[PDB]
Tab-separated table of C-alpha atoms in Angstrom:
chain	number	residue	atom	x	y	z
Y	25	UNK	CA	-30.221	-6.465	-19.516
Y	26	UNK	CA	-31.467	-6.501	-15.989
Y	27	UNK	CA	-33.243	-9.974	-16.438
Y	28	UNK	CA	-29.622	-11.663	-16.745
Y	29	UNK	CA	-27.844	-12.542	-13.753
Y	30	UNK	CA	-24.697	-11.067	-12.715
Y	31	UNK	CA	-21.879	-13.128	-11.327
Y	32	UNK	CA	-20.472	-13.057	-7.747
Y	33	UNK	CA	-17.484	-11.256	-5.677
Y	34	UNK	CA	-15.835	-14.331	-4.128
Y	35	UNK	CA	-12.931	-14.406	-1.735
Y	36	UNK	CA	-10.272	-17.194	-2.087
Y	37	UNK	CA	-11.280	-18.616	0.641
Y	38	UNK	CA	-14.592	-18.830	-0.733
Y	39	UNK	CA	-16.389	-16.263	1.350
Y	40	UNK	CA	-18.979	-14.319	-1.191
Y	41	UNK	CA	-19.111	-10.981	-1.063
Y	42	UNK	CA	-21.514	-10.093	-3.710
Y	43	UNK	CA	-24.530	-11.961	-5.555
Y	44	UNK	CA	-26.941	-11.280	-7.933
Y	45	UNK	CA	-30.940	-12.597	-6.682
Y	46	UNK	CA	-33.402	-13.413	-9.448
Y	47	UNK	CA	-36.823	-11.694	-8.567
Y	48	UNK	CA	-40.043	-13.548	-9.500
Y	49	UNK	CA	-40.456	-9.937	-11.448
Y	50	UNK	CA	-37.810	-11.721	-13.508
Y	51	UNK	CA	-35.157	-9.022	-12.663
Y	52	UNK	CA	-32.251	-9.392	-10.705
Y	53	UNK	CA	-30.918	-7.692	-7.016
Y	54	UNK	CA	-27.004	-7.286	-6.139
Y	55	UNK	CA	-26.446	-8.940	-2.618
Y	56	UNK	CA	-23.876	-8.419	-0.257
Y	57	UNK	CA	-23.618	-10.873	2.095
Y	58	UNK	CA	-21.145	-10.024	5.163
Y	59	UNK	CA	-22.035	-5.991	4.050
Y	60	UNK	CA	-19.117	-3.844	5.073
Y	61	UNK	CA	-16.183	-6.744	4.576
Y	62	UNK	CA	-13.754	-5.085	1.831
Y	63	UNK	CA	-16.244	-2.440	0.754
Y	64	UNK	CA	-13.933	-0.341	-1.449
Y	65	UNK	CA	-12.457	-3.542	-2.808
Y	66	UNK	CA	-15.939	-5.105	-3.745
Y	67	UNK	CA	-17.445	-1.732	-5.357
Y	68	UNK	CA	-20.615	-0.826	-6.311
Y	69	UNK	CA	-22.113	0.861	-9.668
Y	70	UNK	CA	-24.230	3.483	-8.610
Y	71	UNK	CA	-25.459	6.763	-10.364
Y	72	UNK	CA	-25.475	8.830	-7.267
Y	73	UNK	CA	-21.943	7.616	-6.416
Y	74	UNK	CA	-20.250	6.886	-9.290
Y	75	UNK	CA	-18.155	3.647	-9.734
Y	76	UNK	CA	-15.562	1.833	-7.667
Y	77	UNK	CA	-13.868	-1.731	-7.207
Y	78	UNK	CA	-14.372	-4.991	-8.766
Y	79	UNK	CA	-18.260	-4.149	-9.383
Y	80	UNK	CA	-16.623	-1.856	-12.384
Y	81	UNK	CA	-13.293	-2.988	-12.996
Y	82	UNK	CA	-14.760	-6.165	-13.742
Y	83	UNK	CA	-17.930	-5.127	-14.858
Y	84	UNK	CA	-17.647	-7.024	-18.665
Y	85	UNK	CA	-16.806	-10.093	-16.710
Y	86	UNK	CA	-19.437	-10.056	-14.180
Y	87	UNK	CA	-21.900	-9.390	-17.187
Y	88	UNK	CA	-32.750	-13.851	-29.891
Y	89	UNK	CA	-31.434	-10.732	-28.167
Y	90	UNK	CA	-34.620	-9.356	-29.266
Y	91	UNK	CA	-36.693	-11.249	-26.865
Y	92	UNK	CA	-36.380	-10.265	-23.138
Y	93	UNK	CA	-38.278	-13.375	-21.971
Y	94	UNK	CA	-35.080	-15.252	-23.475
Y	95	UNK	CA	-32.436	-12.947	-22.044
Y	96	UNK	CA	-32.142	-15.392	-18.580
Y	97	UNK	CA	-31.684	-18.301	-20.911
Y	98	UNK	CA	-28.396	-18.441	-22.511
Y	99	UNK	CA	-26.427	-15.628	-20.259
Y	100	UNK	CA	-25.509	-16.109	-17.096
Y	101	UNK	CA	-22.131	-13.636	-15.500
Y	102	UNK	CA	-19.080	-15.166	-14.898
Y	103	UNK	CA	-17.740	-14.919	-10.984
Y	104	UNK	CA	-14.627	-12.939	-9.693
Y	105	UNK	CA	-12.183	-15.010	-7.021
Y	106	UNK	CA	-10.224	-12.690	-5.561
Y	107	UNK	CA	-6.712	-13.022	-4.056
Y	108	UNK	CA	-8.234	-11.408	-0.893
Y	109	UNK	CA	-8.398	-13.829	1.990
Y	110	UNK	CA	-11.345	-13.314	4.729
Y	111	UNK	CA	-9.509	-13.679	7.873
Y	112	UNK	CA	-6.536	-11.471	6.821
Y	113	UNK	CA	-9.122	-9.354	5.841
Y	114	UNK	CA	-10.883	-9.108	9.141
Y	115	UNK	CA	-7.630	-8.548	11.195
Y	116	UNK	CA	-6.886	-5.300	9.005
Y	117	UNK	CA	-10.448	-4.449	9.550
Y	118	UNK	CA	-9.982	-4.959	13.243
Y	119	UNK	CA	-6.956	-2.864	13.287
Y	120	UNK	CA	-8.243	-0.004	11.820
Y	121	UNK	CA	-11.143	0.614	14.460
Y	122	UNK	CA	-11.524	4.113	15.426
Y	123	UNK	CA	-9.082	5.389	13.203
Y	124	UNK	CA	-8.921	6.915	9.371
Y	125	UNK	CA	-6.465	5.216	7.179
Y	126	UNK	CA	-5.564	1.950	5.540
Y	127	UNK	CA	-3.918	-1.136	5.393
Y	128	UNK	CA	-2.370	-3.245	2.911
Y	129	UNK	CA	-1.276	-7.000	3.149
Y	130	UNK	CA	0.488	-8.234	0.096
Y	131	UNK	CA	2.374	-11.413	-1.281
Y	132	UNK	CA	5.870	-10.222	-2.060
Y	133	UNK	CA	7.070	-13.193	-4.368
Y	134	UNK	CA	3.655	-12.519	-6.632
Y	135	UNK	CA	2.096	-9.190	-5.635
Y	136	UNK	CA	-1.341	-10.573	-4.971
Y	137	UNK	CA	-3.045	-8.459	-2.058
Y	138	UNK	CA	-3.972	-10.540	0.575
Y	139	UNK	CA	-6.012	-7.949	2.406
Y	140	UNK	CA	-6.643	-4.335	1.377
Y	141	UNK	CA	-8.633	-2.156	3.921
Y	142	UNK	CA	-9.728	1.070	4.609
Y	143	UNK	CA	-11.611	3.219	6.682
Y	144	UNK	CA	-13.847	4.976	7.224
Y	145	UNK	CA	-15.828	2.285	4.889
Y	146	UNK	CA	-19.134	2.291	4.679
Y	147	UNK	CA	-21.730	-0.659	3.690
Y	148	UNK	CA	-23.711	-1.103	0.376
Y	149	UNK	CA	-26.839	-0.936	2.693
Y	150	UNK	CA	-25.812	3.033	3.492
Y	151	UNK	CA	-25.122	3.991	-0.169
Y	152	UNK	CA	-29.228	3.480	-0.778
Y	153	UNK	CA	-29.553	6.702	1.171
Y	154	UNK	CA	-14.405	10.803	3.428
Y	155	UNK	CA	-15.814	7.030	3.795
Y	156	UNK	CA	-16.151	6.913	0.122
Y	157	UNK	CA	-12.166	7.196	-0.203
Y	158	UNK	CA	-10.354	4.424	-1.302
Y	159	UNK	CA	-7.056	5.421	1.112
Y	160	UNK	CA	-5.172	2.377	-0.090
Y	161	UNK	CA	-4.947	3.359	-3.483
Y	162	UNK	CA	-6.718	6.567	-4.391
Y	163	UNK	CA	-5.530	9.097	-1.427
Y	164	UNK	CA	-2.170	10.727	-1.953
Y	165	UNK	CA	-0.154	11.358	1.370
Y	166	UNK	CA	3.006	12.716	2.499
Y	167	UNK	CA	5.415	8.752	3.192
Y	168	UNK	CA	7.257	10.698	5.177
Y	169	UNK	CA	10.770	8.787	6.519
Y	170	UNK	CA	9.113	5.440	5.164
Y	171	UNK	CA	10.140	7.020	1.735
Y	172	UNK	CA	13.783	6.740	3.154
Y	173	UNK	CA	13.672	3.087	2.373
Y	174	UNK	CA	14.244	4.268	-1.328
Y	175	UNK	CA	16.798	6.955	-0.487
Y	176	UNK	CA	19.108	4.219	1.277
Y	177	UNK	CA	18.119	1.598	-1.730
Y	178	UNK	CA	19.209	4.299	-3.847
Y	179	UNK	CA	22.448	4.881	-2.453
Y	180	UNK	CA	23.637	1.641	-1.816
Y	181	UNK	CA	22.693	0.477	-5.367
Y	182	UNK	CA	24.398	2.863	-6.692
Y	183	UNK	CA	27.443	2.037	-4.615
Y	184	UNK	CA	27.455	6.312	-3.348
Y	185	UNK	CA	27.254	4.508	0.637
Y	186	UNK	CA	26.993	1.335	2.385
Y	187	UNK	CA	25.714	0.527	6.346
Y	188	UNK	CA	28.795	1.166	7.695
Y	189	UNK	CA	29.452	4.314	6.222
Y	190	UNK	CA	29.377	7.235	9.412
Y	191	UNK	CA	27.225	10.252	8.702
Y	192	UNK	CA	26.819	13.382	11.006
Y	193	UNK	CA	23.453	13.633	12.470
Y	194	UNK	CA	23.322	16.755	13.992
Y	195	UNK	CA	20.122	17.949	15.697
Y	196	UNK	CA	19.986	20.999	12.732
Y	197	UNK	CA	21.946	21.621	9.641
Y	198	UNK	CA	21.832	23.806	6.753
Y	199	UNK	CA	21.688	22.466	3.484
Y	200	UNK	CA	20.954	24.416	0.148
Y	201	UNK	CA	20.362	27.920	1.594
Y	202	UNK	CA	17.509	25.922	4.285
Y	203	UNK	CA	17.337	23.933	7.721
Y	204	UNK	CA	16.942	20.212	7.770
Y	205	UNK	CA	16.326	19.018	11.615
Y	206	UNK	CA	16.108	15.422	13.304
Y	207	UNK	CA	12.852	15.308	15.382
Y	208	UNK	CA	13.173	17.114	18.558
Y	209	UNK	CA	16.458	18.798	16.946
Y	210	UNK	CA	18.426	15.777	18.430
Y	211	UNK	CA	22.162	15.971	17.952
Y	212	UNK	CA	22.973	12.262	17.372
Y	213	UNK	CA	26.640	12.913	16.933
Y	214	UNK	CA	28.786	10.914	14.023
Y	215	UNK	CA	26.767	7.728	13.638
Y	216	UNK	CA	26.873	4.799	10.621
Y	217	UNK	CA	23.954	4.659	7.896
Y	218	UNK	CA	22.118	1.537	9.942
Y	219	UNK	CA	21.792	3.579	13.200
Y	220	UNK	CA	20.802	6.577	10.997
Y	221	UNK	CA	18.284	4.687	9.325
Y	222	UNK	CA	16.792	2.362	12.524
Y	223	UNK	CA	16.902	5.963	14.198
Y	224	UNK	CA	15.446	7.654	11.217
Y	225	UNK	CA	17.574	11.147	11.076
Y	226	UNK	CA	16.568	13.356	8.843
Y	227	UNK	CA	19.590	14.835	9.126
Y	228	UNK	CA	21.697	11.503	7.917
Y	229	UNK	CA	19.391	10.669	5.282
Y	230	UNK	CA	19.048	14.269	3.747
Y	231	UNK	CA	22.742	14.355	3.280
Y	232	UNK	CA	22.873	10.763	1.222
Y	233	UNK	CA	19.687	12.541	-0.695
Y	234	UNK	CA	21.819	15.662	-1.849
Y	235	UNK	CA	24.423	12.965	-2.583
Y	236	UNK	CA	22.808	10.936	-4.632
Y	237	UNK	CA	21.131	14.003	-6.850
Y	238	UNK	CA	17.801	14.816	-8.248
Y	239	UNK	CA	17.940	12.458	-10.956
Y	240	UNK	CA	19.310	9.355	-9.126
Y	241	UNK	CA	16.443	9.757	-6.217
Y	242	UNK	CA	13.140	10.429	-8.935
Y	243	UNK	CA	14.848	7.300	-11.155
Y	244	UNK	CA	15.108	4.996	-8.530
Y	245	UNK	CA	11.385	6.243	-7.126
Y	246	UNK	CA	10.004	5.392	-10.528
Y	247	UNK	CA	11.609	2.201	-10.855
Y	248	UNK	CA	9.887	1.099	-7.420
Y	249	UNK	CA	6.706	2.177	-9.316
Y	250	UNK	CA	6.603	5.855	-8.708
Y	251	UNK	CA	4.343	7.279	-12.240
Y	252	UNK	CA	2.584	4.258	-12.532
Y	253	UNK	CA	-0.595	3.075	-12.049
Y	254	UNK	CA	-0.115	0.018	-10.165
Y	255	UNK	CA	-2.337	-2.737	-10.236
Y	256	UNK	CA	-3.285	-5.694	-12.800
Y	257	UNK	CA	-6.737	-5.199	-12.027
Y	258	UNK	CA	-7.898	-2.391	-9.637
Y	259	UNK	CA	-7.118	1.302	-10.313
Y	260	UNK	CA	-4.279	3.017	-8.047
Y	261	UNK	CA	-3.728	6.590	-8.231
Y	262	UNK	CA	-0.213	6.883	-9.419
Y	263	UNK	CA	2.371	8.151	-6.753
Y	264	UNK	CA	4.412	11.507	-7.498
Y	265	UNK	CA	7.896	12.703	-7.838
Y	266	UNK	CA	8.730	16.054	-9.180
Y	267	UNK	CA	10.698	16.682	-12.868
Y	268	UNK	CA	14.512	16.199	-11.210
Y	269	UNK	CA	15.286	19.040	-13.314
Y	270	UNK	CA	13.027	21.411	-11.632
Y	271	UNK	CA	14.242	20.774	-8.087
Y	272	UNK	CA	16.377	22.580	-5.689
Y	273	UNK	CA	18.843	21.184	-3.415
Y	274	UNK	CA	17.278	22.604	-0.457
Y	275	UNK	CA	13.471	20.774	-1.567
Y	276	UNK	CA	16.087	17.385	-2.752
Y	277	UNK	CA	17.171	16.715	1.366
Y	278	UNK	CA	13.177	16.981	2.264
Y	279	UNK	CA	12.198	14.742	-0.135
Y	280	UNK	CA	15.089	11.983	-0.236
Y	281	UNK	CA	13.113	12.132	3.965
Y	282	UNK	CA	9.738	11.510	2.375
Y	283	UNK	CA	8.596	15.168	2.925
Y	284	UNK	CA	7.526	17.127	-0.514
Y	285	UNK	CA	7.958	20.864	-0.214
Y	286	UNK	CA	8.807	21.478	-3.743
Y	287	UNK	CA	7.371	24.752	-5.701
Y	288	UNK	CA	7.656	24.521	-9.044
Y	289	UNK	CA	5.772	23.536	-12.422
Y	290	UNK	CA	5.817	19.355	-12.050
Y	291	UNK	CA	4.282	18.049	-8.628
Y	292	UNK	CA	5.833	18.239	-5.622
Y	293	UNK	CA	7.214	15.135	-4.109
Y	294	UNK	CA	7.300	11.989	-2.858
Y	295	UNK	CA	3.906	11.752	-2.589
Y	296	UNK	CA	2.592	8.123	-2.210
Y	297	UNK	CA	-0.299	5.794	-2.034
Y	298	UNK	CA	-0.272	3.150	0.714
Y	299	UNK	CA	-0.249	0.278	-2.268
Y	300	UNK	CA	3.037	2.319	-3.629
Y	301	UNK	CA	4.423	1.640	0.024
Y	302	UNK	CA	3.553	-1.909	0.576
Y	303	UNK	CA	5.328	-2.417	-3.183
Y	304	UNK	CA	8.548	-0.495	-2.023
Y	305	UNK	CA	8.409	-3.371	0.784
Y	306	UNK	CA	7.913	-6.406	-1.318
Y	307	UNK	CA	9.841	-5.443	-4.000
Y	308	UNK	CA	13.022	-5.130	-0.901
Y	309	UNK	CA	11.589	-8.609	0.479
Y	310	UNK	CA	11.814	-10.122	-2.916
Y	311	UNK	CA	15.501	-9.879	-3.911
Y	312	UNK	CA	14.562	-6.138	-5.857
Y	313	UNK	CA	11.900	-7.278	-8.145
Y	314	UNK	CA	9.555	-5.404	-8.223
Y	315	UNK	CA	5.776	-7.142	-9.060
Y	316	UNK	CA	2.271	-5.551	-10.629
Y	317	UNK	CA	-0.013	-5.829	-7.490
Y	318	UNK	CA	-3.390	-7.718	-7.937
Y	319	UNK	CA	-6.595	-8.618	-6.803
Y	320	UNK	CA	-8.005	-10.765	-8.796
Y	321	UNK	CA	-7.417	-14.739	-8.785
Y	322	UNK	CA	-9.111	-16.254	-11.284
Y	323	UNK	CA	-12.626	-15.882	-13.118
Y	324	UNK	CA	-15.141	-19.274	-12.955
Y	325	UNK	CA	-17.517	-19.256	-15.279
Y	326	UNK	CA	-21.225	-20.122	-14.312
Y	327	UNK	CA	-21.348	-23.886	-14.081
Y	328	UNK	CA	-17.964	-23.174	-12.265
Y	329	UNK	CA	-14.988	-23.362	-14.455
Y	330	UNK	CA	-12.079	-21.387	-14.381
Y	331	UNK	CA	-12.212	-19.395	-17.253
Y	332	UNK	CA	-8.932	-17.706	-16.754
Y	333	UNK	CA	-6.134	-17.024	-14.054
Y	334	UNK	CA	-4.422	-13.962	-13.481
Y	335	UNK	CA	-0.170	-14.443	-13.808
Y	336	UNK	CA	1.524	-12.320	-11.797
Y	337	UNK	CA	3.719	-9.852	-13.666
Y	338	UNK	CA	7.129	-7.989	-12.909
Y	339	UNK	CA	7.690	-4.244	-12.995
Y	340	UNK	CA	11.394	-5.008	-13.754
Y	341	UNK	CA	14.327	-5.087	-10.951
Y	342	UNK	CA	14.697	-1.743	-9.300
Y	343	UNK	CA	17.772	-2.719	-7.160
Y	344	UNK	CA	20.081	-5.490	-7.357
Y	345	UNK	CA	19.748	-8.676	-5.096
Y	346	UNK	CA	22.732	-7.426	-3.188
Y	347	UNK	CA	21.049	-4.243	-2.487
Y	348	UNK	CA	18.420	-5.384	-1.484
Y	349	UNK	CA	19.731	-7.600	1.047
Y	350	UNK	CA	21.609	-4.465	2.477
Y	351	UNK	CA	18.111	-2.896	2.960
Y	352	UNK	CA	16.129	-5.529	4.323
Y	353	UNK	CA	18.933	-6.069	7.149
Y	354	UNK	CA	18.407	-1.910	7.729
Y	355	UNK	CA	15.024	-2.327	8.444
Y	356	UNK	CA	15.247	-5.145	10.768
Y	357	UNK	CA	17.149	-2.623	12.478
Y	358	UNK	CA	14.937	0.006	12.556
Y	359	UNK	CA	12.176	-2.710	14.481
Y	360	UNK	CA	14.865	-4.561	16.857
Y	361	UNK	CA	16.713	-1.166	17.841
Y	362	UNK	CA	15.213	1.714	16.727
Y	363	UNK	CA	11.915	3.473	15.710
Y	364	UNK	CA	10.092	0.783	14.662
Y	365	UNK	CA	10.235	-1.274	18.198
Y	366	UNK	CA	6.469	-1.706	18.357
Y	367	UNK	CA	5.921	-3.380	15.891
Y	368	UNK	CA	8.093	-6.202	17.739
Y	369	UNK	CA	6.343	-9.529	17.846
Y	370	UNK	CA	8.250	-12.145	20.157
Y	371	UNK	CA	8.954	-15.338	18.027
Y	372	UNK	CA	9.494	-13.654	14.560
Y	373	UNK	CA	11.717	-11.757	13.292
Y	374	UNK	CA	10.176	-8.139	11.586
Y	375	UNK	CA	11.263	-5.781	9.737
Y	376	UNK	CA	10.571	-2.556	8.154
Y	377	UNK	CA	10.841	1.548	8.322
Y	378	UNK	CA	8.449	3.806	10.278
Y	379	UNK	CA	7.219	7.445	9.267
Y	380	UNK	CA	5.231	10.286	10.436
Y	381	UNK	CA	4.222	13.191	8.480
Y	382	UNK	CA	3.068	16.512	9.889
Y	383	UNK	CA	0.227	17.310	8.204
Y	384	UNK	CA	-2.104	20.371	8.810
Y	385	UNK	CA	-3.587	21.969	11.679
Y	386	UNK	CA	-1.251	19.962	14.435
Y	387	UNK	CA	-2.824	16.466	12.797
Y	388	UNK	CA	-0.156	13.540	11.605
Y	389	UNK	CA	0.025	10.777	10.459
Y	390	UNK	CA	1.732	7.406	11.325
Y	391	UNK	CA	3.372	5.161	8.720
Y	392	UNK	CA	4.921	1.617	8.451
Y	393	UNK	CA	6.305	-1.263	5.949
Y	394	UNK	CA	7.453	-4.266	7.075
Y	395	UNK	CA	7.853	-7.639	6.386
Y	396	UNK	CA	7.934	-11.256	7.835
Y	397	UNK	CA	9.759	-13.382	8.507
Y	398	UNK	CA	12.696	-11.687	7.804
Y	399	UNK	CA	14.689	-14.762	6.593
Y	400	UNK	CA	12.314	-15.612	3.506
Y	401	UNK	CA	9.292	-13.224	3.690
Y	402	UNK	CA	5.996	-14.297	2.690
Y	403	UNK	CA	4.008	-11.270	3.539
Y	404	UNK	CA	4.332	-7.314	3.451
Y	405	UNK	CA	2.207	-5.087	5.071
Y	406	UNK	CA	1.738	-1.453	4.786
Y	407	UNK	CA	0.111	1.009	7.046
Y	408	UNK	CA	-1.154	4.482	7.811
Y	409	UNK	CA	-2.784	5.460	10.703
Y	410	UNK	CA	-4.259	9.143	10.423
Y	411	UNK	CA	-4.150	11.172	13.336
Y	412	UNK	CA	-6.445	14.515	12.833
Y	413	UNK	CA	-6.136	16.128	16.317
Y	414	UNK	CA	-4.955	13.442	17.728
Y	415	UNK	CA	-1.075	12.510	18.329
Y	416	UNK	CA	-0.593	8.346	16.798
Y	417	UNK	CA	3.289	8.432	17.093
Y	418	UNK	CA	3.927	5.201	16.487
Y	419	UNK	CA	1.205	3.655	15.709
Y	420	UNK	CA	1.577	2.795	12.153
Y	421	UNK	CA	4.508	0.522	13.632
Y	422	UNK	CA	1.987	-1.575	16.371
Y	423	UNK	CA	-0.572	-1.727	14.003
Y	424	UNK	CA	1.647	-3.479	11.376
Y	425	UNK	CA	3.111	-5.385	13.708
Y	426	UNK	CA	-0.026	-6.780	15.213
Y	427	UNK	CA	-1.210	-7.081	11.495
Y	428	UNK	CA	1.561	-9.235	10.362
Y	429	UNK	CA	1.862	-11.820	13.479
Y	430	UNK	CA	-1.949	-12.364	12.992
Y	431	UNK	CA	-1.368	-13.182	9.426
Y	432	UNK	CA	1.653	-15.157	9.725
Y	433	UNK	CA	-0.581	-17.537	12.439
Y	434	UNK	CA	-3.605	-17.096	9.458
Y	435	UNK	CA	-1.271	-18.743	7.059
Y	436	UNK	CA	0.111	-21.125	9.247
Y	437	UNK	CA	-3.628	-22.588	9.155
């Protein structure tokens, strides 16, 4: 079982990422050329460390039985092409330095992830001897006022609001026996929905939250893929929203803003993975249908043959078309006038929604999803940028930005 040679980890751009080298022993050692690309994505299978990636969740694939001396003969393992393109890859890499957190890149019309990074990684070389972490799909976090892209989904699709509607957005306000407050305790005065959301009040957006109702807000969460597992082919941790039934309307404003400060039996909610975010995104850039991420293109068999090709898959519609148009326009908002500014990139048009989530200790972190272009989107990105200690206000926003203008020029060729 060691004397038959395991296929390789290829990128669609045909960069390999893993090998398997026959030994004159007979044997057979895992390579991994450009060490420290994708780690998380690419895996390993190790006793110390356990499992991860496409090393294990495609570890059948990338696999006279009495004779060893025969084993090399007829076997050979069939190679993984993933969806994952090197030079997206590299820019997310490249935007991460120096900080914890993750990025996603994703296709919205398909859901294949384009690039998938996070960091601290690590290199197979180190494992021989918190970077271990997955953080685009196996960390849970606080989404924070990016969540509010679901609130305002919510309540347009259910025809409770629309863009135009005025809300008061006081600096503080009491709803359900506690205090919901805009950052700095800004009193924004009477303002409509699209300034509330570019702006991102928490003030606003609580108050469509308690309109909407416990049921409406975890319904419309799950239909964006909240409770599931996302992913064709790679293992996401699913993201969390509390039983409706057990929530208060106090803990209901919080988390229609992202913030989960429930106390009861079921979880507290929202809490997200950054894959659950860039979904939210591409399931708003693609008319409200909402696709099964993957990572995997196709599987060639040794002599090189495709042996199969992944189709990519709906989760269903989670708001209508119309809706949907409604929220992509918000966002564009939120990065022309509002919170999301630097994420600007002159020549295209981006959109998205911005968070931050106070976390522990003074640390936060910085969120964004976006899209581009904003007239027919062919990429989402989504973003966390983990302070610890130190203030990143914003940075989730010029990170995706940067991100998604690198791409776009990527895919232009």
């Amino acid at each position: 079982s060691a004397y038959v040679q395991r296929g390789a980890i290829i990128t669609s751009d045909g960069v390999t990422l893993a090998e398997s080298v026959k030994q004159d022993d007979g044997t057979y050692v895992r390579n991994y050329p450009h060490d420290g690309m994708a780690s998380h994505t690419v895996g390993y299978i190790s006793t110390q460390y356990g499992t991860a990636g496409i090393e294990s969740s495609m570890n059948e694939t990338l696999t006279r039985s009495a004779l060893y001396s025969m084993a090399g003969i007829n076997t050979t393992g069939s190679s993984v092409v993933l969806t994952i393109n090197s030079q997206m890859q590299a820019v997310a890499e490249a935007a991460l330095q120096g900080y914890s957190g993750s990025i996603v890149v994703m296709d919205p019309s398909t859901g294949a992830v384009l690039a998938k990074a996070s960091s601290p990684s690590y290199t197979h070389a180190e494992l021989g001897t918190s970077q271990l972490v997955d953080r685009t799909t196996q960390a849970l976090y606080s989404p924070g006022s990016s969540f509010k892209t679901v609130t305002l989904a919510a309540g347009i699709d259910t025809h409770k609001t629309t863009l135009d509607t005025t809300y008061s957005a006081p600096g503080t306000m009491e709803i359900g026996g506690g205090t919901i407050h805009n950052y700095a305790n800004e009193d924004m005065g009477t303002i409509p929905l699209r300034e509330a959301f570019a702006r991102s009040s928490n003030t606003a957006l609580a108050q469509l939250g308690v309109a909407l109702g416990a049921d409406n807000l975890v319904s419309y969460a799950r239909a964006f893929g909240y409770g599931t597992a996302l992913g064709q082919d790679f293992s996401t941790t699913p993201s969390l929203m509390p039983n409706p039934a057990e929530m208060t309307t106090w803990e209901l404003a919080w988390a229609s803003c992202g913030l989960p400060v429930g106390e009861h039996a079921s979880p507290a909610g929202p809490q997200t993975t950054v894959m659950q975010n860039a979904v939210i995104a591409a399931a708003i850039a693609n008319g409200g249908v909402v696709m099964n991420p993957y990572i995997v293109d196709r599987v060639l068999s040794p002599e090189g043959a495709v042996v199969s090709t992944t189709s990519p898959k709906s989760l269903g519609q989670a708001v209508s078309a119309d809706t949907a148009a409604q929220v992509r326009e918000a966002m564009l908002g939120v990065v022309e006038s509002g919170t999301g500014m630097g994420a600007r990139v002159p020549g295209v048009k981006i959109a998205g929604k911005t968070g931050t989530a106070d976390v522990e200790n003074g640390n936060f972190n910085s969120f964004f999803i976006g899209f581009a272009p904003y007239d027919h989107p062919t990429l989402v990105v989504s973003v966390v940028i983990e302070g610890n200690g130190e203030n990143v206000l914003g940075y989730g926003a010029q990170v995706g930005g940067r991100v998604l203008a690198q791409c776009l020029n990527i895919q232009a060729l």
